[PDB]
Amino acid sequence: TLFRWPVRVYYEDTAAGGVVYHASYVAFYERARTEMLRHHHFSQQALMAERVAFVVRKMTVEYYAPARLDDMLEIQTEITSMRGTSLVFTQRIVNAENTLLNEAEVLVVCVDPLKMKPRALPKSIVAEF
Amino acid sequence: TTLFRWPVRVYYEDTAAGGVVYHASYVAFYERARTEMLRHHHFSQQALMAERVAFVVRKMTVEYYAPARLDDMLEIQTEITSMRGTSLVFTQRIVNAENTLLNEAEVLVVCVDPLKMKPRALPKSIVAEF
Amino acid sequence: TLFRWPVRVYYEDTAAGGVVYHASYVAFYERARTEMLRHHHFSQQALMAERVAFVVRKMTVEYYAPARLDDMLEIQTEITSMRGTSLVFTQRIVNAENTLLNEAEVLVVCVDPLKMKPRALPKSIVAEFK
Amino acid sequence: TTLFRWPVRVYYEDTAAGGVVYHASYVAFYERARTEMLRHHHFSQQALMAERVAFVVRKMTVEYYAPARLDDMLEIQTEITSMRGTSLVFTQRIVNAENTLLNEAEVLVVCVDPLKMKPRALPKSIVAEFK
Ligand SMILES: CCCCCCCCCC(=O)SCCNC(=O)CCNC(=O)[C@H](O)C(C)(C)COP(=O)(O)OP(=O)(O)OC[C@H]1O[C@@H](n2cnc3c(N)ncnc32)[C@H](O)[C@@H]1OP(=O)(O)O
Ligand SMILES: CCCCCCCCCC(=O)SCCNC(=O)CCNC(=O)[C@H](O)C(C)(C)COP(=O)(O)OP(=O)(O)OC[C@H]1O[C@@H](n2cnc3c(N)ncnc32)[C@H](O)[C@@H]1OP(=O)(O)O
Ligand SMILES: CCCCCCCCCC(=O)SCCNC(=O)CCNC(=O)[C@H](O)C(C)(C)COP(=O)(O)OP(=O)(O)OC[C@H]1O[C@@H](n2cnc3c(N)ncnc32)[C@H](O)[C@@H]1OP(=O)(O)O
Question: Where do the catalytic residues lie (chain D)?
């Protein structure tokens, strides 16, 4: 099931060319994944105290069109694959005219954050998705 | 003054090793709140740029009283406390969900022509509003 | 050939939990491409005079092991293919024990800065990196 | 007056729309220079964390006189001007390649135990380095 998250573009996100810096979109995608988890009752600050954490293992981003200061964007996010210790997020960003700006596929691994050691997905998360 | 409130969620990008918000992130938070205060009064800084009007920070003092942390929902509070000629002073504060005062700042802002970095007078539209 | 660029990890690059934030690596790779180009005298000035800019079209990043605060990293960068209007950069990050932390493949398109429309690579870029 | 100098190149990531360096990026640059001044004196904050020693910014004043721009090579200049109990004051400035003064800052830094966010005395070996 799709999760939608709005993001306003501020000065901090722009670069000298007048458009959003290509790495700023990477952060935007992370916020949307965090809010999708939050919507299903997962706080990563809370989980870290339980020695549960999620890290990016692989990421592909393809850039089609720019965003500019003051644009209101929408990040669209789905969990498309789920396995033992990892899951795949498929994401994209559109602007207020529904123009596709870019899209990403993100492989995420569940780890023990003190050992950086992969651990099985909590069955709560497997059931919730 | 007419106070303006803006909520901000703390994400991983805002945090640093050791588990508190990085000190420069607060500076960005304060800027977002000034931008949204302007938006609430019908001003767009992308729009004003084509009109050769922009705002730059000239001086800033920040007090860090207590840390924010990952997943905190914060409130930025913003007032314009002084205006004259080309510049204005914002007084801003940050509180958390307990109403703990985490941070406060005083920001001197100068209106400039962006293609030249010259100070120019605050345009009458702005000063009329605030 | 191979171009090497050192990068020190600072607090701004780290996140809560004590590792480098994943988007920080993306900026590190961009610095190394910029410095690779500079090493061949393709400074920003030189690119502007050639009426070219470079934009990232597609990028894949593999995160094998974390960098941490105070690590001195080495970014290794090579142009692995060059065709028409685009370049592919292959890049890797190792730490001071030569542990492979990260690698990336970056498709970069040559654009004119007016419409940001694709344009053929400058003959000097082609001549230098063939 | 044992000044420490640190060079910084301005990259795209540091700039904002309009073509100047974003005002918060200077704050990061000053932090890098303090960290390198500590490193030159043989201290690592990652290592100090393991000993429950950390440094946090308590107050900062920044003055923006003139902008840095893409690809400028800057020099950050840093001195410790006060050192007392749990805290130090850093005085810093940024010049560009023509020695134009772009920026000045004063930063009050407090030593804390990072697990309790509670101030503690400066490590004796750090006090010895900068006295
Ligand atoms: C971490 C501190 C806690 C706080 C979290 C901070 C949150 C902030 C968010 C970020 O910015 S994360 C920072 C950037 N990312 C990193 O630093 C991660 C660095 N990578 C690692 O440390 C290791 O790669 C990792 C611990 C994630 C995995 O180690 P391994 O090499 O032992 O993984 P392994 O080979 O055992 O396989 C793990 C899973 O990935 C799958 N996998 C690995 N490579 C794959 C691939 N290339 N394609 C498809 N699947 C792949 C693999 O099959 C398996 O799936 P399953 O067990 O569910 O079947
Ligand atoms: C820390 C983990 C590893 C290090 C990471 C370094 C990252 C890189 C550098 C940074 O980015 S630092 C992040 C930004 N700075 C901060 O988060 C510092 C936040 N400030 C504090 O936690 C305290 O002010 C500090 C421990 C430094 C000093 O506490 P004190 O009480 O000893 O000093 P002070 O007298 O100056 O405190 C002023 C006011 O803050 C109040 N306060 C202090 N800590 C508080 C607290 N934890 N919660 C609520 N209020 C607090 C304090 O009681 C007092 O209130 P009143 O004036 O009304 O009496
Ligand atoms: C095009 C940008 C559009 C907006 C995009 C940014 C929005 C996002 C928010 C930010 O991140 S703002 C970026 C950080 N802030 C700055 O870069 C502001 C830099 N400051 C200046 O360019 C000038 O100080 C300013 C135009 C604001 C005022 O110039 P003034 O000379 O009329 O005022 P002032 O007397 O306060 O300037 C103090 C000293 O700086 C000197 N100065 C100013 N501009 C200079 C310059 N360009 N080159 C060398 N010196 C300069 C000025 O002459 C004077 O030197 P002296 O008192 O020692 O004689």
Answer: 16
Where along chain A do its domains lie?
Answer: 1-129
Contacts across the C-D interface (CB distance below 8 Å) = 33
Structure tokens at B42: 């019908």
**What CA–CA distances, in Å, run from C51 to A22, C33, C56, C86, C116?**
21, 19, 17, 15, 11
Beta-bridged to residue D74, according to DSSP, are: D8
- Breaks in chain A at C–N > 2.5 Å: after which residues? none
Question: Which residue, D4, D80, D91, is CA-closest to D40?
Answer: D4
| Residue A123: other Cβ atoms inside 10 A | 8
Kindly state the tokens that stand for B123.
């345009």
Q: Where are the beta strands (DSSP E) in A1-129?
A: 3-8, 53-63, 72-82, 86-94, 100-112, 117-118
B29: left (phi over 0), alpha (psi -120 to 50) or beta: alpha
CA separation, residue B121 to residues A82, B7, B111, C68, D17 (Å): 58, 31, 7, 47, 22
Which residue, chain included where needed, has tokens 């721009």?
D69
Residue among A18, D104, A13, D67 at smallest CA distance from B116: D67
Resolution of the experimentally solved model in angstroms: 1.7
Cα(D88)–Cα(D81) distance, integer angstroms: 8
CATH number attached to the domain at B1-130: 3.10.129.10
Of the partner residues D18, D54, D59, the one whose CB lies closest to the CB of residue B114: D18
Q: What is the second-level CATH architecture of the domain A1-129?
A: Roll (3.10)
Query: Which residues of chain A lie closer than 8 angstroms to D15, CB-CB?
Result: 15-16
CATH fit for domain D1-131, picks 3.30.830.10, 3.10.129.10, 3.40.50.1820, 3.40.50.300: 3.10.129.10
Nearest to B22 among C11, C18, C19 (CB): C11
C-beta B16 within 6 A of ligand 2: yes
Q: Could you give the CA distance from residue C82 to residue C121 in angstroms, rounded to a whole number?
A: 9
Q: How was this structure determined?
A: X-ray
User: Ligand 3 atom closest to Cα of D17?
Assistant: 5
